[PDB]
Design a protein around this nucleic acid. Sequence first.
RNA 1: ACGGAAACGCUUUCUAGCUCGCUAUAAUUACCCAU
RNA 2: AAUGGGUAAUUAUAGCGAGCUAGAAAGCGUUUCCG
Lengths: 353, 217, 162, 55, 121, 121
Amino acid sequence: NDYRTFKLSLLTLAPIHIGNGEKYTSREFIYENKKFYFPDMGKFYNKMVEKRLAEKFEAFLIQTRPNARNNRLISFLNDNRIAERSFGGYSISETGLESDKNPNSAGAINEVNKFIRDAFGNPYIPGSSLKGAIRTILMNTTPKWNNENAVNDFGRFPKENKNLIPWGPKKGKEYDDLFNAIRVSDSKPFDNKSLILVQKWDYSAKTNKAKPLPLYRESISPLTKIEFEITTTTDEAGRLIEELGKRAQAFYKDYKAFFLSEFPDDKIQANLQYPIYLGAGSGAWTKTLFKQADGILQRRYSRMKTKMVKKGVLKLTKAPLKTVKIPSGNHSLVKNHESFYEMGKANFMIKEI
Amino acid sequence: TFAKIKFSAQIRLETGLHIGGSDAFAAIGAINSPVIKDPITNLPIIPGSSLKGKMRTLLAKVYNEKVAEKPSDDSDILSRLFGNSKDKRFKMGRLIFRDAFLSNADELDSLGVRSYTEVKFENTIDRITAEANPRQIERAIRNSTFDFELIYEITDENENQVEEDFKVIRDGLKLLELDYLGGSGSRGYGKVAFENLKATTVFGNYDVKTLNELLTA
Amino acid sequence: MRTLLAKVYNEKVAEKPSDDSDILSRLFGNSKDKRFKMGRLIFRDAFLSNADELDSLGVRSYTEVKFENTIDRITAEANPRQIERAIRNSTFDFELIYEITDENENQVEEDFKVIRDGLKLLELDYLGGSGSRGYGKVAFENLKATTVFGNYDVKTLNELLT
Amino acid sequence: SLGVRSYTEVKFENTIDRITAEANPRQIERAIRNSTFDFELIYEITDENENQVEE
Amino acid sequence: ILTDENYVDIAEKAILKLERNTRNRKNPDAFFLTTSKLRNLLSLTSTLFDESKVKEYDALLDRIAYLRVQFVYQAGREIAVKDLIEKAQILEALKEIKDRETLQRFCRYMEALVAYFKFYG
Amino acid sequence: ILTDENYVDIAEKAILKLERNTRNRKNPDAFFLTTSKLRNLLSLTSTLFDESKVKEYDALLDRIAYLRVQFVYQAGREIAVKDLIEKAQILEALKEIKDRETLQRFCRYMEALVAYFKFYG
RNA sequence: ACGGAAACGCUUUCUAGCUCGCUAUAAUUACCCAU
RNA sequence: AAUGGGUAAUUAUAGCGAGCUAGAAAGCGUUUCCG
């Protein structure tokens, strides 16, 4: 009876991609209609061996063309007159903002990522992913854990002192383990049709053109309501969960103070709820207790993909424009044209039972 | 007078539980933390020890005043049903937790199932410097329904209590729904439901008509 | 199988195996009686019958090791166990020599109410080891009686082993 | 060559004392199964048999 | 060809035959093949090694034939992978993969390639 | 090389040759190799030591060849394990593992390494 | 016409009771490359 | 400038590795033949 649950009604106000660690490469999707289709490529290969095209198909996956739509899998169907859907059935619709808006380059996307799913096929946001977003809010807005952390004591600096929040069995003394007493459950498995497959857009202060990037994360469409059960046992983990309305705003206000300053206000959008950042999006300042990582964090990229002289680069999408119209008037949901959202910007509200 | 009482509940998952083992020769870039399977059928199972370890350790905060340091210090309502090795008369007490193997072998199929165990990639993200540390753990899939087969054991010592020793069974079948049935538990991993309980008498001609109707509240 | 049958046929709590009643002691034997030694039943060790049938299937080794830590009650430590146990569908040849002494009289049919019930309690209780944590669930199948020594008719008895 | 390092196995058993349930272990040594022992029974024939060498 | 005895020292000698970056002697002996490129080939094989222990061969051979697609496609572009599959006889090892024991041998042969790549790196 | 007489004092002298944390003299003499890292190598060998007592050598040598994968992969990353397998001659001991008696000797040689690690810790 | 003859080292006995493979862990980071 | 491509990291980390009860317990230690 010491348990007391919560209902974190997560509302996506941004493209949110989560998980699965694997990717559909190029030549593994067909742009037949104005909707994508991701077959089972073992089942695709078995039908095509029966249609006697396997030597042509391996000769298809070696030669490039100056055009790009003839280097996708739909050209192998039209040059050999394939007339069935019939494969490992998974298909999403599209918007037109996936590829370059110009028609010639349309449907020539490459290397989409995947979204985490169960073995049934219906996607969900897992509880392990939603809990890592809560932990950074609970990291950065305590004054006791955001101290001079990340003592290496050996070798190279990136070693965070993970033994700063008590979590182990800790022999002799009594088991406290705060994060054992915060128990984030998974989502309900929602539908495939809220997936829009955005691409990542980098935006810096200098070089004001927002450069494209060939990431093609299949993300959740915004304005989708996803609920979570978060059950807490003890008093200390009990109090830190309804406090999140004052913790996530205090996180984001400290996170508006830099990396959301020094930018135009056009690309950044409003909050309208309690803000939170899920995975695979704006990172390294959201997936980071950020005050002690700024000096340290840029050491890892003295490379060709060099992290800039400033803090970092803004992470952006191009998703279809929607409004909520919840305040007096239609809430404009952006401060620009041309469909820029920032990736991973979620919102929630919390309530017991 | 001697009697045995069987409880054929059905353990249906909502978040997929991870009762681990260790495949010692696992692989690189594969499941480095598997679930325990049935050794022939390779279906994921729930052992009775993971059930009995979560029945007792959740009823040791409810039906145990002067909270126990060891399992030998349980305050002799819990030791009467879960056994107590440091006692003259409580060794092997009256409950047998049979393993819940699998029931819906072909009801999970015709929903679309490649394998009966899903694989989840999980990534300990270092907060400072954003280092990544992935892990791949197995889970029994969402709508998997297991065969709970708890067996009660009536001697001539049981007299008045018989029925007192089922509210602790009914609450153990209820305090675990508010918790996880093992697992990398904090994140999801066994938020489980104990559906359609049914007590029957499998030996000794004992009546369970008044016994069933206190398991439906 | 004695202690399961001890809870049915004693009428008082026997503090010793010698204090079991005269229906247990004339099957399992008693040492304090000079009349119930050389007990009637002879139990032989059960070996793997289906060692070839567990071969060519999804199992490789005939024993699987189960990893089983405990959790400390107040400090939540761990202490990992590795308890070996036989795999699921192993089938064991079981034989149950009963010796019809000339003093048996009409007790032969009373004993088979006891042995079958001893085989029916083992299908409800466990068989060896950590039985309140699983590890039991023994099913006796293909129960039938044959006369390995002559001059007895089990035609009206194999229906009791249905 | 059917690898056996010592020809006598050691079987571990116990006793569960009734009403106290405290075990009482035991280590009894047994010759292993496919040991084959040579048996020689000798029936001696004299003139005092008189057609009893088939009974 | 690779048997249950020699599927590791073939894989060790294969990694040593990968020609290094003899150019640009600052931080020398680096391979043209890179780590995250090789793990793409392993993630193919180290999900059949899991499913072979659970499923049979005949309900699984559709993904096995698609390895011959992937190991050619990943090596048809970005020529350092073609340097692997010609030296480490990958495409020849997929010719003989007729059983679960050989499926679990080639999927384990790829893990020896990732091991000595990480060791000699 | 290790025989039935010397497979323990070789393993004792191996652990003493592991270079300590000479840096950071608060709680000194700690090893760069850690306990839970070493047990990953033992769990490999202390499941062949069980199956060698039950099975024959020829129906078991596929997992034996994969030890040469694992002891290189676990030592190719996180260099403190490479400090073990160069000092404790692990990869040389896997060259001579042709019989059940040597398989039960190396799998018992690893247990002496875990023993003196726990003792000198 | 053997310090011999006849004599089962044997009867009864569960390797058993207690024990969660658990604890912490966003599949994520970086922003270019080819000509 | 357009075009065509993604690329590089980490692949589990740290802990426990069994603990405690019982360690044999009841009988028979010669009987019969014999003077």
